[PDB]
Ligand binder design. Structure first.
Ligand SMILES: [Ba+2]
Lengths: 214, 211
């Protein structure tokens, strides 16, 4: 069963360079053309590059041509994407994908995705604050002042799954901030201990904030 | 570049109902049109390849119709399990090109939000800051207006608003309105109210607290 696992995404300074890589498997790699397609929220899916099964032929859409260089090592069954002179409009999630053809055709198989954030802003851990009250009670957690994305959020280490709403983060300058809320029966609190767990992988910042009655 | 145009941009429809997504090419493409489905947080899933050829494993309620420049993707009946974003892709000429994407919403029964308000946390005041948060949960439709009034007075700055995607279980939306403001300006005020305007009800739903 085909599998494409790309890795390499990161926070790169504008004008910087980066090298993504795709690890194919489950199929004879050197019998298909490979490709990278990137997707942004505001522009949707957009083809970035393709390379024939023999690596002899490459294809780039003007907007990226000259900057991105798609290559492949049929030995290791790996597909690369060397990016240079990065620009902000380059920020996006990049997918590794296969054509059912030896040169180029539609996309039959997709990878998991890797995100590349092209920014100047510096990495910076979040400040997690508990939102205690002040039927069934509703508690919340407020992650604020972090960058870059993403930041994972769970309640009671994932044991608390129902009633959880984690709202998308929003940019307030060059610092994201998001929040989550959980509703629990009136009896299970504060008799029971509800905890919030925030993890900012970027800054290797983990945090468990307990929601105590103000 | 053969340019594809997809519409509608976002379509709301009730379960069981039919869904017709349309894609039009900048030139003739014969039937080198492919369709893709993409659920939240996931990558795109192949559903229909060239020649309106329904890729294997895909339920029969899905079908591609069209040849030349007019193409159509449909669903004989909307199921809770089809709430996705759809993209069409012409694979006839380079560069490959996708459509703007169509976003499906499960039109459900109206429902009013359950507004909840919270006064800043002790430690936040410490760092010298104040964030009043307001949670409006499980409502529909998605359109709603939240306002922040401090001491009966209006206020529109420092307000961060966020909406969750449509809940995959009850088809409702939830949003977070969170007002920020200096620990200083917070202190020298008393009435903090979160007022929500929504189709579900007439008079604005109001939640608040003092001091
Ligand atoms: Ba073709």
């Amino acid at each position: 069963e085909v599998q494409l696992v790309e890795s390499g995404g990161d926070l790169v300074k504008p004008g910087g360079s980066l090298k993504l890589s795709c690890a194919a498997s489950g199929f004879t790699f050197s019998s298909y053309g490979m490709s990278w397609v990137r997707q942004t929220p505001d522009k949707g899916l957009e083809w970035v590059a393709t390379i024939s099964s023999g690596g002899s032929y490459t294809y780039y859409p003007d907007n990226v041509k000259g900057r991105f260089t798609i290559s492949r090592d049929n030995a290791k069954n790996t597909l690369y994407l060397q990016m240079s002179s990065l620009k902000s409009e380059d920020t996006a999630m990049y997918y590794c994908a296969r054509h059912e053809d030896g040169n180029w055709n539609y996309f039959d198989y997709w990878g998991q995705g890797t995100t590349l954030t092209v920014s100047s802003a510096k990495t910076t851990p979040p400040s997690v604050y508990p939102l205690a009250p002040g039927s069934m009670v509703t508690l919340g957690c407020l992650v604020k002042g972090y960058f870059p994305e993403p930041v994972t959020v769970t309640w009671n280490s994932g044991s608390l799954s129902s009633g959880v709403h984690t709202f998308p983060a929003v940019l307030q300058s060059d610092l994201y901030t998001l929040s989550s809320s959980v509703t629990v029966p009136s009896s299970t609190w504060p008799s029971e201990t509800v905890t919030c767990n925030v993890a900012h992988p970027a800054s290797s910042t983990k945090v468990d904030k307990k929601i105590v009655p103000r | 570049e053969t340019t594809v145009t997809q519409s509608p941009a976002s379509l709301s429809v009730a379960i069981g109902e039919k869904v017709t997504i349309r894609c039009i090419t900048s030139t003739d493409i014969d039937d080198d049109m492919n369709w893709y489905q993409q659920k939240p947080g996931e990558p795109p899933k192949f559903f229909i390849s060239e020649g309106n050829t329904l890729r294997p494993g895909v339920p029969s309620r899905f079908s591609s119709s069209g040849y030349g420049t007019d193409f159509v993707f449909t669903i004989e009946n909307m199921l809770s399990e089809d709430v996705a974003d759809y993209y069409c892709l012409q694979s006839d000429t380079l560069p490959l090109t996708f459509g703007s994407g169509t976003k499906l919403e499960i039109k459900r029964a109206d429902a009013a939000p359950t507004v909840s308000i919270f006064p800043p946390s002790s430690e936040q005041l410490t760092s010298g800051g104040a964030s009043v948060v307001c949670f409006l949960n499980n409502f529909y439709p998605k359109d709603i207006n939240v306002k922040w009034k401090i001491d009966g007075s209006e206020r529109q700055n420092g307000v961060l608003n966020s909406w969750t995607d449509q809940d995959s279980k009850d088809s409702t939306y939830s949003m977070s309105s969170t007002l920020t403001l200096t620990k200083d300006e917070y202190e020298r005020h008393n009435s903090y109210t979160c007022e929500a305007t929504h189709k579900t009800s007439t008079s604005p739903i109001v939640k608040s607290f003092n001091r």
